[PDB]
Amino acid sequence: GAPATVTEQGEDITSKKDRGVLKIVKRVGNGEETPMIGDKVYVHYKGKLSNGKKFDSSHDRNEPFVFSLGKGQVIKAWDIGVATMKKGEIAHLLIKPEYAYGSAGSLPKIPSNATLFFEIELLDFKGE
Numbered sequence: 157g158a159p160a161t162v163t164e165q166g167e168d169i170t171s172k173k174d175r176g177v178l179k180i181v182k183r184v185g186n187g188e189e190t191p192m193i194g195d196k197v198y199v200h201y202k203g204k205l206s207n208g209k210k211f212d213s214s215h216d217r218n219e220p221f222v223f224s225l226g227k228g229q230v231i232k233a234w235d236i237g238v239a240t241m242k243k244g245e246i247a248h249l250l251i252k253p254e255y256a257y258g259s260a261g262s263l264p265k266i267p268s269n270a271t272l273f274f275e276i277e278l279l280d281f282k283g284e
């Protein structure tokens with residue numbers, strides 16, 4: 157599946173090179189710019205536990221997911237991964253627990269030591 161393909165082919169985009177955040181570009185975006193810290197970012201996404209036991213989508217509200225990059229409004233893996241994306245890009249991310257919810261998890265929704273997968277479309281970003 158998509159998650160295994162990321163395990164096998166996915167670029168390690170962590171600073172520490174600990175394979176905590178693996179990325180595949182699935183559709184190339186436009187222009188050179190990628191968002192900066194503080195930028196307002198607009199995305200569509202689908203997400204799941206790698207266990208496929210819980211599945212979440214912005215599509216479920218028909219409306220984009222909006223957050224400020226690098227403020228830790230989202231898990232660390234997103235601040236890291238969406239920062240590498242161009243406008244219009246779709247990427248797959250596979251995420252170890254250290255860059256998601258950790259040993260504590262986020263129960264009852266997310267268990268301890270959970271690996272997460274997302275598909276993310278970067279719709280737009282705009283400055284603070």
Ligand SMILES: COc1cc2cc(c1OC)OCCn1cc(nn1)CCCOC(=O)[C@@H]1CCCCN1C(=O)[C@H]2C1CCCCC1
Pocket residue numbers: 201203204205210211212221229230231234262265266272
């Ligand atoms: C841990 O709780 C949740 C996890 C997730 C979605 C959740 C959620 O309930 C609060 O509700 C959807 C609405 N939403 C999104 C956020 N806050 N609420 C952003 C901060 C938390 O989410 C994150 O940082 C990441 C990245 C941005 C999209 C959402 N996300 C998630 O971790 C998802 C998970 C749901 C279960 C399957 C994996 C993804």
